[PDB]
Amino acid sequence: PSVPLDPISVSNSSSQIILKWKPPSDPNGNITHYLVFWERQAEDSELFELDYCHRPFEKVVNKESLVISGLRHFTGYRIELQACNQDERCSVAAYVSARTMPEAKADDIVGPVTHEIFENNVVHLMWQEPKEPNGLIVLYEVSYRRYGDEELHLCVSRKHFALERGCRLRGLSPGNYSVRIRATSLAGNGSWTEPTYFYVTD
C-alpha cells in the first residue's frame, strides 16, 4: 500500500501524545490496520558537563489517530507509522518526531533550606535538589537580599552545586538577609522558594 498521509504529532498533556494521519492515497486493497511504533531517544551526554556561567507498539484498527500514554515528561520520541492490509506486507514507514510536555512542579524545590556559618563568617547553604526534574536541571540561581536593598543573583552551575553540595557565600557584612531560590532546568524556571531569613552576627 501507499504511504500514510499527513501525519501530525501533537502533545496536549505531559504524558499523552496525539498522533493524527490521513489514509494512504493508494490502499490497493482493504486496509486491515495501522502499525504505530514509538521509541525513546536518550538524553544528550554533554548537557551534564556544561557550565552556563521489539518496542511497545500498537495496531490501530478502524481509526486514524492514537493517544500514547504513560510517557516520560519533556522527552523526545521517534514515532514510526506504517499501514498493513493483511496479517507481512506493509507500507513503507512515515516518520515523525515529538517532544512531550514538561511537568508542572518537577523543578520546584521542596524540603527545608538549611544553612551553616563558619568561624570566618562564611555561610554554607544546603538545599535538596529536585529529585525528578524536567529533563535535567542545568543551573540554580542564588538570590540573597538585605532588607531594603535591590535583588542580587548568582548562577550556580551543576559541577559547582554538586561539588560544594549546595552553595557557599564568602565574607558578607552582618545583618538579616532574605533568600529566594529558583531552579533553572532545560524546560524553564521552577517556582521561587518562599523567602527565608538568616542573621549573621555582628
Added chain:
Amino acid sequence: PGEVCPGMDIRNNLTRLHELENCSVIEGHLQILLMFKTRPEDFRDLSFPKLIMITDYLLLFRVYGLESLKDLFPNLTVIRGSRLFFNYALVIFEMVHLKELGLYNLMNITRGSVRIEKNNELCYLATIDWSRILDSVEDNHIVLNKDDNEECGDICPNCPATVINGQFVERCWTHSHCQKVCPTICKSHGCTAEGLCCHSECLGNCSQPDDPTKCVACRNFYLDGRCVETCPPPYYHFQDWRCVNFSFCQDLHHKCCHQYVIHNNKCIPECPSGYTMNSSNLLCTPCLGPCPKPSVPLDPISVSNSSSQIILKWKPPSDPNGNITHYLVFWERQAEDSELFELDYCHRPFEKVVNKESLVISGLRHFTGYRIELQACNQDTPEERCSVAAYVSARTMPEAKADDIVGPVTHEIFENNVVHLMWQEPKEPNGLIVLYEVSYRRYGDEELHLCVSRKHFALERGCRLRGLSPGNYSVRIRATSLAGNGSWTEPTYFYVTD
C-alpha cells in the same frame, strides 16, 4: 592512488558496499538507502578511508543504526557535483540515530548546495561554517533537525573560532575533530597543518606545499598523478575530471548504455542537438537541416546582509496584461515599542526600479523595523496605472560597538561607605538599552551580579552599591540592549578603606 569505480545505488543490506573496498574516486554518484535491518554493529567495523572524492552527489536516506560518518568516510574531501540531486550535491535525509557528520576532511563542495532535513538526532551542525566550504549557502536547506531545537552541546576539542552574524563561535566537526581553517590567500587550494598554502592546482588539501604531485584532490583535472588545468592534445576531457585517450573512448563506444562520441575535446555520451556522429572518427559534425535518424508582485523577500543595506527581492505579477515598465519601492521607519520604556526587565523616500527585480536600500538606521510597500507599474508616461501594494517588514542589523560603554568609570564613597558609581551611558545604541549588569568581585571569590533597569539607572545617574566589606574590588560592566550584550568593560579597581 586507488581505483576509480562507477556509481552505486546500495539498498537493503551492506553486502554490495564491500565492492567499494579499493575505490579512491567514485565516478558517478553514491546513493545509500532503505536499510531497515542494519544495526550499529554492522558499521562499527566498516570503513572506507581510501575514498577521497565523489564526482556527482552523496545521498543517505533511511539508514538505521548509523550514528556518524567519521569512521565510514574519514578522508572524503571534495564533492564535485557533476550530476546533482534536484540541484543538491549532498543529501542527508531521515538518518535516524545519526548524531554527527564527522566529515572532518570535507573542504569544498564545488557546485550545488547542501540539504540536511529531518534528522532528529543530528548535532555538530552549528559548529560548521558552510560559507567556507560552498560559494553559495543561500540555497542550503538545513531544517527540522535536533540542532534547530537547541539541545546540542556541541563542544569542540584549540579549534579556530569565527563569527556567524554577531556571535563568535568555535568551529569543529566532532568532539574530537576541529574544523580546518586556512589563510585567506589559500582558500580553494587547501593548506598543510602549519598553514603553508598548497599548490594552485590542488583542491582542499595536499601532503606538501606548492607541489602539484602531492595534492589530495585537483582543482581542475587529474592526469598521471598530477593536477592539470586542462587536458592537452591528444587527450580528451572525460566526465569533466579526468583525461583519457582516443582508444579508451573508442573501447567504451564499441562495448556499447550510450555509445560515446567526441566533441569539443570531450568524450560525451551523445552528440548535442543539431550534431551527428561521424562514424569513423567519432566526431560530432553538424547536420544540414534536420539530423537523419496589474496583479500583485509575487514572492517578496526582505533580507539584510549589512547594518545599512536591505536587499529586497520579488517575482513579477502573475497577470501583467501589458509590458511592465517599472517597480515602485517605498520604505518607512517604525519608531519603537512604547512598553519598552515602561517595563522593568529585572511622501516617504522611494525608488522606481527599472529592468530589475531586486533593490539594495542604503543609509538606514541600525536595528530598526521598516514597512516596505512594493508596487508594479506597466505604464508611466501619460497618467500611471499601478498595482495594489505589497506589504513586507524587515529589521536592520545592529551595530558592532553601539552598546559598548566608553569613558571613565567614576565612583564616590559616602560617610556610610556606600559607593555611588557613575559611568556615561552609550549615547547611540542598537535600538535602546533595556538594562545593565553590575558585576563587582572580590579577588578569589565567585562572580556577583546586579540587574539595573532603565528607570533605576536614569534616576540614580549610574549605580549605588550599599554596604560592602573593605578591600580592593574589581569591576566589569555589561550593557544589555534589545539587540544583545555590549562588551564587558575592562576590570577597574577600587579600594574601600578598612
